[PDB]
């Protein structure tokens, strides 16, 4: 039977929120995505007989480890834990600001949150509800069963109930790396990693790659080499992956799907047998641009190009749909692909694994449960591990000689370089690199810092800037 081969690759990442001089985690996002997504996404494999794959960046792994050991000093989480009588005005303000940032997301759909945000002043009981409902809004699928009664209570929480939630949340974090190891050892999914701090490897290897698809971009004078650092990000990531999973990684996810001829050469030289990237890069690079083939870059490394439409349906569209409409839509598009060719297509669905669900009803749990249940009941769909996709023999292949460098942002680098503010960050990094004395310069090469720079004002951007500049300073000492 002619099957459609479906490959999910869920990419998990957080930049380092731990400020190097105080040791404090200045934003809680690793904690909240750990309790909501990083355990629960692979845990779907306990209940659905499909294959799902995951990327974990090493810098994310480091932070999960620190939280699991009780070593993470998370400033926002300490304000949640406190009795409200001990909250500083600054801490109350940060709690309200965090609530307002998240207020319109369906995971914050508690009538008590709307009441609390319409109040001039908050008393102890109201602040206790504000703290506890912020915790509960990030509840993952597993604990939405354990904590179902607290979630339904909706108000009038006690300090002891809040502490119970915190304890269960840390229990989930402590089991998180173990469940990735478990689904890997059981063949239910493959796990990949990325260069250590999620940098833009093509730019570190050769900043002139930005001209390949944006020839008119203005960038600063890269008067220092980042090529050895690019190698170090890959090598350190192989070491961390070996510690956690017991092999050198043969699959990597390039951050931001970013590839170039030189980056593909580096990954191959470091022992990577397969990566994936974006469909826009495929169309920019070749004329006969089917994303359903396994490509071989210069007969040396395997490359899959994700189906951008399917990936972006989950990432951008379906949060606003009901779950049955969305799953029916997704299956219907898969049927069209299946019927459109006489061979067995390989269909990569690759996107962030933790960022879209907060915009779905009930944290995307009705959608994913229905999607996975429906997929496992379609005979003509076979979901694959990355290992299976790499080695599948009954698929079509093609050799590719050259790619036009870019990312999954429209095949180019403009989200990280090319305006005044983003270029200032590269200038700061370039000068720091000339004076660098330790691996904190690698932390500052993470793509996240440049992503947030030079964008229309938002809460907490000042924190990303404080972190970036602190790592740059620490790198020189
Ligand atoms: O409110 C912003 C946005 O919020 C929510 O989106 C989340 C998303 O759920 C997360 O998965 C993550 O997205 C990842 C993607 O998973 C990953 O694929 C990639 O996306 C690239 C796209 O593939 C590429 O097309 C392009 O995206 C463009 C996009 O095509 C433009 O349409 C425009 O998107 C706007 C949306 O159309 C609009 O609906 C809204 O999006 C919501 C979204 O509905 C919600 O689920 O606003 C956006 C922004 O104006 O612009 C984007 C460029 O940003 O490029 C991206 C690569 O950059 O990477 C993203 C993360 O970067 O995070 C988003 C929130 O950022
Ligand atoms: O003000 C705009 C936005 O502010 C808030 O967004 C938050 C997120 O909710 C946080 O989770 C965090 O974002 C992390 C993100 O969770 C993490 O996965 C990683 O994202 C990378 C991603 O791995 C990569 O593939 C590509 O997509 O780029 C991303 C960005 O580099 O790192 C993020 C931090 O850099 O922080 C942001 C900013 O506070 C708010 O919730 C949003 O609704 C809002 O749009």
UniProtKB/TrEMBL annotation:
Alphabetic keyword roster: Carbohydrate metabolism
What are its GO biological-process terms?
carbohydrate metabolic process
- Gene3D superfamilies found in the cross-reference section: Glycoside hydrolase 38, N terminal domain (3.20.110.10)
For this protein, the record's InterPro entries field holds:
GH57_Enzymes, Glyco_hydro/deAcase_b/a-brl, Glyco_hydro_38_N_sf, Glyco_hydro_57_N
Domain (Glycoside hydrolase family 57 N-terminal) spans: 7-398
Tree of life domain: Bacteria
One Pfam family assigned to this protein is: Glyco_hydro_57
Q: Which molecular function terms from Gene Ontology are attached? A: catalytic activity
Q: Does the keyword Isomerase apply?
A: no
Indicate the family of this protein: Belongs to the glycosyl hydrolase 57 family.
The protein's name in its UniProt record: Glycoside hydrolase family 57 N-terminal domain-containing protein
Provide the species name.
Aquifex aeolicus (strain VF5)
